[PDB]
């Protein structure tokens, strides 16, 4: 660890040097800091080539008759899809709605999302106008790598001679069209010499400060490090707004190949900028020779609701506070029929949050599906895929996916009623091959585990898929509507992103409550562990405007495994209660847990108490007596491993989850087992709304 080349004294720079992990990341920070200290990193003044006095903003006074004619020379679009996550089926649905053989599709998948990449590859192999970027970057939120992704794909696209495209559109997996393809081509064919960028239009000085454009930023170790200050180059105008746009080929050529004073310096300046794509393309355009092509409209609708979408949610990824647009709901449908201005795409859409609005929008554009079409109201989302390995999983999800598989195996045995040999007895084998989330009518239905097992009657391996559903635990005895416990609370969408509520000893539960309209009220909350120990108690103010309330009580770890309980009171008057499971782990570092580990993990906190303040007084006043036997059995349970520990866990899962059904993928000896492709709930069942087939005469897929 050699010292730097310059004395580093900046509070911001030193704060980054400390939190940084890798040595490579420490030196790259010092180098960046010392270069800017010497005034050799950022440009100071820039040439403006625009002949105009300021901003142009050519209007597109919109009449509905502007998108009805047939173009004799229609434009061909190059769609660039920057995707990441698990929603492969939703992305396949949107790709199906925007596809036309005359267009082109260039897909960049985040390096973190290998599962999604494997699926996108199967699409690029079917169609000659679909390709995937051989290069893949970790496009963190706000990261400077996003502009590097766009600028590279423009270079790559301009060099693809066999792709004569005219426009450049960027879409995410949460975007969806709100107008047909024929109308898009007609509108763009009439304005093929324009560039569509949307500006903030508000105060420019406040936009610069809020965006941090006068701050030095560095991307490294998948983090945006704030290093210090910088001046705004003199002699140019700086503008920005939305980073979703349409750009014509001629202007993409200029950004890519030009070597003038403007493009060169702006590529250096924005290499160290937070959210560069929200400002780089505006600045270059307004100061380039193409400044008279700017239309102040990106042709997008963005569901901004800062009252919910700004919670400084990206604090752990960037050294700045970020905002995010919200997801559309069925009530937002009428907004897609607005007359004011031209709009062709909208975001964000998340199937796991609300699919109804997606189905409404798609049928409104391209008609209903035939009668008897299966799966139109269902959604499946893969959450684990065998090729990514069990080390991609945690010890919690691995212990509980194994349990669900066994639970399903026990339902197969009990389903066949006979006095002879049971041809539905199975012995589990290996590790799960995949897991899926399952939704029906925007209602979470549970997990789908695919797994291997030996049919013991015929002594043969079989592949199976199991459906498990959680048992309802919310009970009412008022403004209260619901109450839940989980981790990964999404403040924007106000829901848990850990859907199954899978928890282990070392997790930190969060208790959420949902309230309806009414006057202010103060309630009480009580947490109770599996052996009637009260871990915490606190009161909450529920104002007249309160719709959701949550809190994470500070509990010393590890938590005692078992079925916990959370109760809500109102001056000693019971209101409701809910239950959650803290599952004991059968795996340590993806290996069978040892007694010295199981002992130290399944036997309450290391301080013999969850908090410093005790609550032994409330136990008698709540009929919560502590049984000397159950406390004894809990201490004897902590010591168990292997078979005995398996019986402990499966007994807890059994009391909190239900194996709804189980199907076989191939041949099976169990006569009461249906084939997965013939069921309504399996991920093997038909799902035409997301299935991609052959192209039709009209050049379409939908």
């Amino acid at each position: 660890d050699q010292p730097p080349k310059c004395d580093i004294s900046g509070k911001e720079a030193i704060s980054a040097l400390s939190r940084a992990k890798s040595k490579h990341c420490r030196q790259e920070i010092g180098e960046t800091y010392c270069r800017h200290k010497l005034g050799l990193l950022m440009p100071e003044k820039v040439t403006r080539f625009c002949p105009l006095e300021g901003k142009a903003n050519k209007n597109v006074q919109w009449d509905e008759d502007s998108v009805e004619y047939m173009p004799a020379n229609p434009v061909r679009i190059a769609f660039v899809l920057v995707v990441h996550g698990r929603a492969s089926r939703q992305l396949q649905r949107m790709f199906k709605a925007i596809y036309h053989k005359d267009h082109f599709y260039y897909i960049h998948v985040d390096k973190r999302s290998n599962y999604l990449h494997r699926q996108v590859l199967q699409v690029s192999r079917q169609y000659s106008n679909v390709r995937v970027t051989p290069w893949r970057m970790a496009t963190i939120w706000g990261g400077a790598s996003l502009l590097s992704t766009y600028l590279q794909s423009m270079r790559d696209l301009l060099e693809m001679t066999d792709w004569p495209w005219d426009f450049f559109i960027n879409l995410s997996a949460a975007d969806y069209p709100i107008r047909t393809n024929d109308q898009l081509v007609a509108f763009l064919s009439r304005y093929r010499d324009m560039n569509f960028l949307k500006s903030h239009g508000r105060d420019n000085a406040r936009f610069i400060r809020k965006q941090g454009l006068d701050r030095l930023f560095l991307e490294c170790d998948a983090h945006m490090w704030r290093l210090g200050d910088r001046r705004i180059p003199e002699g140019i105008a700086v503008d920005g707004g939305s980073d979703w746009f349409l750009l014509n080929r001629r202007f993409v050529e200029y950004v890519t190949f030009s070597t003038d004073d403007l493009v060169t310096k702006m590529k250096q300046f924005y290499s160290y900028t937070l959210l560069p794509a929200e400002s780089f393309f505006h600045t270059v355009l307004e100061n380039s020779p193409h400044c008279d092509t700017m239309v102040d409209n990106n042709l997008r609708i963005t569901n901004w609701n800062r009252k919910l979408g700004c919670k400084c949610q990206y604090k752990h990824i960037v050294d700045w506070c970020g905002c995010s647009p919200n997801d559309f709901k069925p009530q937002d449908f009428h907004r897609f029929q607005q007359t004011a201005r031209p709009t062709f795409f909208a975001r964000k859409f998340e199937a796991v949050v609300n699919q109804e609005i997606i189905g409404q929008l798609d049928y409104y554009l391209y008609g209903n599906y035939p009668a008897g079409t299966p799966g139109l109201r269902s959604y499946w989302e893969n959450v684990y895929d065998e090729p990514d390995g069990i080390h991609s999983l945690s010890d919690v999800t691995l212990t509980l996916y194994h349990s669900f598989a066994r639970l399903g195996l026990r339902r197969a045995e009990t389903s066949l009623h006979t006095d002879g040999e049971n041809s539905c007895r199975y012995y589990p084998m290996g590790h799960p091959a995949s897991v899926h989330l399952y939704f029906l009518a925007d209602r979470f239905q549970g997990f789908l585990i695919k797994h291997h097992a030996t049919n013991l009657a015929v002594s043969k391996l079989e592949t199976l898929e199991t459906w498990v559903m959680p048992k309802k635990v919310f009970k009412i005895a008022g403004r209260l509507q619901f109450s839940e416990v989980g981790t990964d609370w999404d403040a924007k969408e106000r829901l848990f992103r850990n859907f199954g509520g899978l928890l282990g000893p070392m997790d930190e539960p969060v208790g959420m409550q949902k309230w309806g309209k009414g006057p202010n009220v103060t309630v009480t909350v009580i947490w109770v562990d599996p052996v009637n120990v009260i871990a915490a108690t606190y009161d909450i103010l529920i104002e007249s405007t309160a719709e959701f309330t949550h809190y994470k009580p500070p509990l010393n770890l590890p938590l005692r495994p078992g079925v916990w309980t959370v109760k809500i009171l109102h001056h000693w008057v019971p209101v409701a209660e809910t239950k959650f499971l803290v599952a004991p782990l059968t795996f340590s570092n993806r290996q069978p847990i040892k007694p010295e580990e199981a002992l130290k993990l399944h036997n309450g906190p290391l301080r013999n108490a969850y908090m410093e303040q005790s609550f032994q007084s409330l136990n008698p006043v709540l009929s919560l007596p502590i049984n000397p036997a159950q406390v004894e059995q809990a201490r004897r349970n902590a010591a168990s491993t292997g078979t005995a520990l398996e019986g402990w866990l499966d007994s807890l899962v059994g009391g909190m989850w239900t194996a709804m059904d189980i199907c076989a993928t191939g041949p099976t000896a169990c006569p009461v087992m249906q084939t997965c492709s013939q069921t309504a709930w399996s991920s093997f069942s038909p799902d035409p709304k997301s299935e991609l087939g052959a192209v039709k005469p009209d050049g379409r897929l939908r």
């Binding site: 809020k210 965006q211 920005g240």
Partner: peptide
């Protein structure tokens, strides 16, 4: 309606 994804330093 409005644009700009950054909220601010704090």
């Amino acid at each position: 309606e409005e644009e700009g994804s950054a909220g601010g330093q704090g």
